[PDB]
């Protein structure tokens, strides 16, 4: 009787072309989402993003969907995302890590620089021992996956 949350997390990046400057070659957004875009705030209370020290206010707290930070700049670096859950879900938070990408890597064939860069990780948060009240609040929520019920027949 476990509850799990399929998620996707990573970033999208857009090269600015003739609008690119030394300060800002790309606009990007880093995010954690439901893998099928359902509302994971059924479990996620807030997400804390840690950006590089070169940004103003490098620790951002996003309390409401969408759980994303949108920024622009010139460089790639590691982003920490700490997921804090509602109190009936889990008293421990979960940290995720994502290397921000502004260019596509590992690419055959010809590319164009204006193509949006999407680099994201597909994953699933498992809560192994859900309380009975947590179950009653979120049962069969579209963002969650539940154990298939054995046939009584």
């Amino acid at each position: 009787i476990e509850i799990s949350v399929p998620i996707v997390y990573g970033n999208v990046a857009f090269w600015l072309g003739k609008k690119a400057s030394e300060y800002q070659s790309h606009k990007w957004a880093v995010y954690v989402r439901g893998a099928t875009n359902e509302d994971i705030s059924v479990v996620v209370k807030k997400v804390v993003f840690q950006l590089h020290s070169s940004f103003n206010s490098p620790t951002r707290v996003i309390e409401e969907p969408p759980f994303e930070v949108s920024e622009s700049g010139w460089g790639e670096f590691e982003i920490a995302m700490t997921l804090h859950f509602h109190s009936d879900v889990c008293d421990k938070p979960l940290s995720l890590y994502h290397h921000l990408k502004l260019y596509p890597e590992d690419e055959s064939g010809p590319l164009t620089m204006k193509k949006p860069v999407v680099v994201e990780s597909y994953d699933e948060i498992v809560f192994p021992d859900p309380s009975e009240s947590f179950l009653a609040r979120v049962q069969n929520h579209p963002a969650l996956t539940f154990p298939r019920l054995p046939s009584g027949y």
Binding site: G75, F77, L102
Partner: peptide, 6 residues
């Protein structure tokens, strides 16, 4: 932390 242009 490390930060570099691609």
């Amino acid at each position: 932390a490390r930060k570099s242009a691609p």
